[PDB]
Amino acid sequence: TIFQFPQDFMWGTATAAYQIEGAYQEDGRGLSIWDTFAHTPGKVFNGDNGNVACDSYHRYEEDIRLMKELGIRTYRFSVSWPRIFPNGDGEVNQEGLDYYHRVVDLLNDNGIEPFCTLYHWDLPQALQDAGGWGNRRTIQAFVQFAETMFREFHGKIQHWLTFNEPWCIAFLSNMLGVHAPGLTNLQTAIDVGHHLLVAHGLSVRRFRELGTSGQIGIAPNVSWAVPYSTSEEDKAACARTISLHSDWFLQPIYQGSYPQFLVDWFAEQGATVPIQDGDMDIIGEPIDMIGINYYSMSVNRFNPEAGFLQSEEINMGLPVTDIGWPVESRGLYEVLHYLQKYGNIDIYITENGACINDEVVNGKVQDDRRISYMQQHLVQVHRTIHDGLHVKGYMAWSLLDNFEWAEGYNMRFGMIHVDFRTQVRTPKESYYWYRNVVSNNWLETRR
Amino acid sequence: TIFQFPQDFMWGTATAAYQIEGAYQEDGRGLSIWDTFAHTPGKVFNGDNGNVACDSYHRYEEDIRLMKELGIRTYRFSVSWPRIFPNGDGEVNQEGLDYYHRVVDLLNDNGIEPFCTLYHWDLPQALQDAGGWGNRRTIQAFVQFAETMFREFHGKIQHWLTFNEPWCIAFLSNMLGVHAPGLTNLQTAIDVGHHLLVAHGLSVRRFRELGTSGQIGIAPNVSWAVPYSTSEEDKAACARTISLHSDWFLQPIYQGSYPQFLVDWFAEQGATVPIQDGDMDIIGEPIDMIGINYYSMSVNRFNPEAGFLQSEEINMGLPVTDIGWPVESRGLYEVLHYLQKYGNIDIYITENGACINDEVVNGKVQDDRRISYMQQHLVQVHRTIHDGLHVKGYMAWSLLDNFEWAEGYNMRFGMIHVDFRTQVRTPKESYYWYRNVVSNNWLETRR
Amino acid sequence: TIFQFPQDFMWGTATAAYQIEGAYQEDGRGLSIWDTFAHTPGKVFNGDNGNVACDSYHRYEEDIRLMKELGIRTYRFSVSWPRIFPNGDGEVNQEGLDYYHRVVDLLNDNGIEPFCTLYHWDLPQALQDAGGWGNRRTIQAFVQFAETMFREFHGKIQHWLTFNEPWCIAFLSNMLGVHAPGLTNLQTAIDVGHHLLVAHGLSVRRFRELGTSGQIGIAPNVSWAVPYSTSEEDKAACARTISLHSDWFLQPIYQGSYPQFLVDWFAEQGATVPIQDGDMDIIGEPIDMIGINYYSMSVNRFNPEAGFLQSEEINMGLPVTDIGWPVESRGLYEVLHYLQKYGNIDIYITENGACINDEVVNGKVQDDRRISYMQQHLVQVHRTIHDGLHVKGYMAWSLLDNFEWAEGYNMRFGMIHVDFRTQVRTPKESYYWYRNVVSNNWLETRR
Amino acid sequence: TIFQFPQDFMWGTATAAYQIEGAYQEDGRGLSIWDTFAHTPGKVFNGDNGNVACDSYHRYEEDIRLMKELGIRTYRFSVSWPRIFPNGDGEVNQEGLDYYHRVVDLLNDNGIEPFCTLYHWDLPQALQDAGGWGNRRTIQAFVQFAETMFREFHGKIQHWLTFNEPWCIAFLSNMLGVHAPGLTNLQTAIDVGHHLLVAHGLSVRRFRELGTSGQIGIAPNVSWAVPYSTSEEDKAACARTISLHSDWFLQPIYQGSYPQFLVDWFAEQGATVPIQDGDMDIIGEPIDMIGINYYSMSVNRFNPEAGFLQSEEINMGLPVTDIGWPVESRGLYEVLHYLQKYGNIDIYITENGACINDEVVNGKVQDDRRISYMQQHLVQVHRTIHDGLHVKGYMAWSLLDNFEWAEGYNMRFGMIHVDFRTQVRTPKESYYWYRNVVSNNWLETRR
Ligand SMILES: O=C(O)[C@H](O)[C@@H](O)[C@H](O)[C@H](O)CO
Ligand SMILES: O=C(O)[C@H](O)[C@@H](O)[C@H](O)[C@H](O)CO
Ligand SMILES: O=C(O)[C@H](O)[C@@H](O)[C@H](O)[C@H](O)CO
Ligand SMILES: O=C(O)[C@H](O)[C@@H](O)[C@H](O)[C@H](O)CO
């Protein structure tokens, strides 16, 4: 089957600052909660950290040449907040801004459209010390950061995302303790989620007030669960799982309220959203589009012992990637249609990829499983476009193998292999396959 | 995840006569349309035929010992019609009956419940010469055959199936020309389908009139298609695909009529069902259960050039078995729920398996992919039971690698490897895995 | 270095009934708590059970031929209680006795001295239903069982052990829930430990009263822990670890009391030993020797969160066997010297071995690591003998790969490989190495 | 288990001049007793010599870059005496001093603290001709050498060691004849040992008088033996073995006397220490710390035929490194605690490593066994620190594979592989593992 994509479909790859930039103390960069987290014994696999990670702070020219050869039209990357404001709240670091100018100018020189993610988890440690996202003052610090970037890069960037994966930032980091700052308190997770939504709304306002170039949105990671049985309880368990990742952040944005059933659920657990007057109006600031991060899908059932959402994932026996996630691409088709509850909004698949740990053998990386994974998901993308949904682009999660939060360098998601001992880049077989798809602008599945 | 099965769940394996019995001219056996078909250049891969195929006519004792060691409770097999009535219409061949007595007694001696499939495609050539299933006289010949078996094996067999895969017998064989007798005429396919339904109804009547032991049903192969787009036409294309395999045969049986939309469809193509007065009443004879044969699932779209049903299957990029079928077990969960339109009837998964061609290496057959396939499908079985559906048992398609109709011996579906050069049996790794599942009566998926 | 052993040193191998006998329902055998445990989802790896396990109930003649060729002088095996008394408390099953007569006569015919373990964890389910070892009536049932064996095998067996690994029977099974019956209650673990000690004392009395042949003892599994730091608390943590395995059972036997510090420890946790008047006097019945089971050694430190004994084992980086136990043979030398607190009693290393999962490749099992392990431990044995300790013999843990409780068949400890699919025995390279050591009666370590 | 190290723990690697510097006749370097020894047929394996050995005389910049990337804080190296004083006793060679200035400045430029070993066995041949260390005039020559280095490198080096492994210099070289000058006379070995102790004391005095920078000590190789039996004689045999390596040199230094029992032992063999008045007072000069070289541990027994110390090492069957040494890290914990007899002095593990001969395969050196070895020994280091002992740092024996005295290039101890045919350096897998440990400052053992 041949799947032709729209003429102006935006093809790309994506990275995040702390995962690839290698110069954590260079040019006045301050420490982030992730430096702190990775530097704590037991928080990240093997004690790995982003001190060097890919060294893209120095090797960006090479990476950009590689992505130029890929035939890609956009590059999603994130800005390291502590490089711009080493204290979070403070005096601007021109050296930090200079770095992004070098990167952005090179991208633009190469016809590659920057797709800027302002917040990709690297909150300056100084702000965390004051309570981090649990403190409304951090909202102010973020707006300052956003403004600085909007003004500095006004006509160089046309695509902006305020936050990347609000669920991970709030719940995975503050309720489950898996990601920095590693807390386990429902109330603080809810506080964090609410404050980042306020920060987001204010930043969009500034974007509009400053007359900044381009479009702006937010990029939540998307969850998709299907019930094991036809029971109302399994159905509810799946609604909770799905809704906390997306609706919890999208309903306030698009409809001016948090999902009542989840508000009630958390209330049962003694937690309440710290909503101040006009917070909801600020959060409802009109956005241009949203980024959607998708990787897997699950079959769940209600289980009172299954975590704070009492939703248990069943191991259905499906084959899994090297990080253990089952691959079932229909989930992408399903959430995209599910999200239509907010209207036929513009959606970019800002992240989609697979952990496949193949290494360099005979000078190549025969990552057939990543090609397989991508192929199945791109079919779903075409399928939704064919259904009339406004899915505008796709960004392969990871141009490069990188520091994969908590997993360390152990889990490879890149289309370009990076030997962390030499920093040597080796484009995988998926890279060359992707090059053909993005350059031809059509995909073909064959037996 | 641990999946506990019901106390009385019936575990088994299945075969078909022409695929495993090796003695096509022995003990007065007459030729079937399949001997004829396989003996024709170009009809079956490599000119393979069932002349010897496994030689189970002679090696049944060994096979039965192997299935006894498997911990299985039932064995589904089919009866070679031309061994009982070498002419189809004629004088009984006691030698043919003796063979099945040897098999059945041994099964019973070993506590293995026979699950008898009367018709598994081996129509005596003599009847085909007279028009085969296109001729109503064949219905009479079949009822005689059924009666003979019912009387001969009265208290030895408690589970009976009249026909196995009516869709393949009618459409694949008479419209698509892929299986014997290899015709390509819509009207004859429809005639065949209708006549086999009449034969089925009459045989159930005889079963009841003779007071024969056990329960009796029919075993259609089940189809499952999901639409590519949300269009009404893709939806219709999938209804046609799904309905021709099951509803076309189940609606007359359970509701007294053929699916009207398919009646109209075929009428558009100039074909009409040869329904005589009381045919529908005969077909509606109450049955005890049905067998369901499931292997794969597809995503289809309407396409006017896509065959007689104008339903095109999209290659979604999913991994496939060695015969090229994509594995997606949810399809089993879906049809089982879909079939509830006929009531919560008793259903046995009379066939489910995968073509995995692994051979003997280091004295074993490391068929991990078959274990994987089975594991995923058994989860769905448990899932439907947990939903309250009366799924009574499961039979792994193929105890032994065998003559795979049209594919020849090239496509292996067995849990026991058969080296066709020596007839040597080598239980695969899936055999030992299955032995544990059927003996423990619970399954466990692990990472 | 050459290590010459004493002229009359007793060399052997060992097994346990439920781990090797394959005929759990044969000849009237009743179910044991282990059949029950293994038949419960989640209790044993992969749902493995002892239903067939080696099939030594039928293949003992082969096994005995193999051990005769090994040059061994003794064979330690256990008696399946539910084969003798299918109800535990009840009427004798002559068929069960006959089996052991076949085994024992063959051993004796081959000049191999039987070393009989009366209790090796297979308590009849019927007794467990009544409270198992938590009920003093079980003590009576055990004495009946012991008497029966003493009278039946009077002049055929000269070495007897009442219980094998009291720590595992009591604490691992009733406090930690890892072994059958799988309970987690300190008090019941203590009850079980005390009742088995009473059963042991009474059985020794009967042995003496009946004038039965040979010597009789008990075979505790031995623990050995060394402190991480020189702190009093780490030292205490190690004393608890060491003492619960051995002193807890040996002090009542040899000195008429339980280790006070452990009595106090458990008292702090609200558990008290159910000591009735004269229980201690019964337990103090003089024994002829003890069997010692040794596998590993650890370095521990005090940790309040480290289980009921608040003793944490440090992962020192030492290489481990395939089941994950570090090899450090000095621990054997240490406990043997430590046990001298009870006098220079007769000690038999009734168990010592390693989990090394090597399989048959090129017709052999190149288990160099098991040879390595054994070699290091046999040096320690010689060392203690050279120090004047009365270490009388050594039995390699496992003649055959077997059902390894909770680990299933996944963990191989045998010197003879068993392909559980064919029951085919393949003596490992360690078997041939051991044959030379036991036949020459001296060991040689070489570079 | 996670082992956190002290904030200021000093991590490093170590080498010795003759083993790595490749330019034995370059820049006026005179010959040492080792050039002479290696140039004699039969003294060193395969006639290997240090003529080129690693060529670090020319490739130091590369090596230093590699150790900078390692994250190391100190580098232990030795000074080639015959490069400074080509005659030993004579006129200074500025070219030789210049080399070390290039090395030291580069180290300092890279934040790597030089740890200078003045004497690492390369005594100028000219002095050996006059009797070498057997002649007190050599003491004077050494003090001149020491002074020169102290004055030349005053503020560039902060850590100094006078002698490296006095036992090897005296006994292995002059009693056993294995190392240069290869003599076999107890009396001369004792003379050498005493004269080097006097040289050491005088050099420390000069260090203090000149007001040189840093701290100064001596680095004996440490021995550790445990008795086979509990006999007084085996115990004595172990005391002799242990004491000759350490106490023989440390007692005069810290307590002002030689171990009396060893004085008596040698007296029995007709040898006496040539102690002149005030020699002991000079030797007792206060030192800042000591370096400890540890590799293995043994189990010994008394044996009158077992060499001059009549101490036989038993082959306990333990796994060995590629040079044949058994690995048993507890020995490090034991000697460190044993050395507390001199007070809780500052101790640096100046050497610890393993001979693992893995080569470059697939572009890497998979030296898992060296990682294993180091991991076990670093646990012991942490353990002693946790016990309150002042263990200040650890230096992995060998940054690079090198000329391994008498073994030649056949025995590899490096963390960086050196292909002696191309001089190409290839950091081993242990290098990358060590980089993580030294950079994180904590170690983790995992299963
Ligand atoms: O939010 C994104 O998800 C994260 O930024 C990535 O850095 C993750 O590593 C990737 O999703 C794979 O888990
Ligand atoms: O009717 C069933 O289809 C047939 O009985 C089998 O013999 C098929 O060959 C099997 O389903 C795989 O194709
Ligand atoms: O108590 C003994 O340990 C048991 O009898 C064995 O059956 C164990 O499985 C074996 O020691 C392996 O650890
Ligand atoms: O005395 C030290 O030991 C030596 O400096 C090294 O050069 C040795 O060769 C190394 O220890 C290997 O044993």
From Swiss-Prot, chains A, B, C, D:
Has UniProt tagged this entry with the keyword Hydrolase?
A: yes
One GO molecular-function entry? beta-glucosidase activity
An example Gene Ontology biological process: cellulose catabolic process
Q: Which UniProt keywords apply?
A: Carbohydrate metabolism, Cellulose degradation, Glycosidase, Hydrolase, Polysaccharide degradation
Q: Give the UniProt entry's GO cellular component terms.
A: cytosol
**Enzyme class (EC, first level):** hydrolase
InterPro entries this protein is in? Glyco_hydro_1, Glyco_hydro_1_AS, Glyco_hydro_1_beta-glucosidase, Glyco_hydro_1_N_CS, Glycoside_hydrolase_SF
Positions annotated as active site in the UniProt record: 165 (proton donor), 351 (nucleophile)
Function summary: BglA is intracellular and cleaves cellobiose probably through inorganic phosphate mediated hydrolysis.
Q: Subunit info?
A: Homooctamer.
Protein family: Belongs to the glycosyl hydrolase 1 family.
Q: What is this protein called?
A: Beta-glucosidase A
* Organism of this sequence: Paenibacillus polymyxa
